[PDB]
Amino acid sequence: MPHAFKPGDLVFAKMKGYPHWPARIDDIADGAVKPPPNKYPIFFFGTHETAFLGPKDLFPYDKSKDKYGKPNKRKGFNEGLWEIQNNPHASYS
């Protein structure tokens, strides 16, 4: 059975106006800006952006990749697909 989301979990993350996007739940570094309540720091592969999202917009990667893990025209998307498959836990700083 599922747990709550935790740092390191791999997802597709849904934002308004964009396709479901390869992403991971990030840690919050000591000294860094915390997310609002009930939100998670989401690191988007490919664009290397962070947004704060709640679970409604977070789809576990394994379950969802057969639907969402196909190439897309959008800037950074296919790079993102490579990262989540090949080195999802790397520093992209």
Q: Cα-flanking dihedrals φ and ψ of residue 68, to 5°? A: -110, -15
- Side-chain half-sphere of 18: how many Cα atoms within 13 Å? 15
Which of 8, 18, 82, 92 binds ligand KF8 (CB under 6 A)? It is 18
Evaluate whether 73 touches 15 at the Cβ level (below 8 Å): no
Q: Give the strand order in the sheet containing 58-60.
A: 49-53, 40-44, 21-25, 10-13, 58-60
47 sits near ligand KF8 (criterion: CB under 6 A):
yes
79 sits near ligand KF8 (criterion: CB under 6 A):
no
**Residue 3 or 81 having the CB closest to ligand KF8:** 81
Binders of ligand KF8: how many residues, by CB under 6 A?
9
Least distance from ligand KF8 to the Cβ atom of residue 20, Å: 10
* Binding positions for ligand KF8, rule: CB under 6 A: 15, 18, 21, 44, 47, 49-51, 76
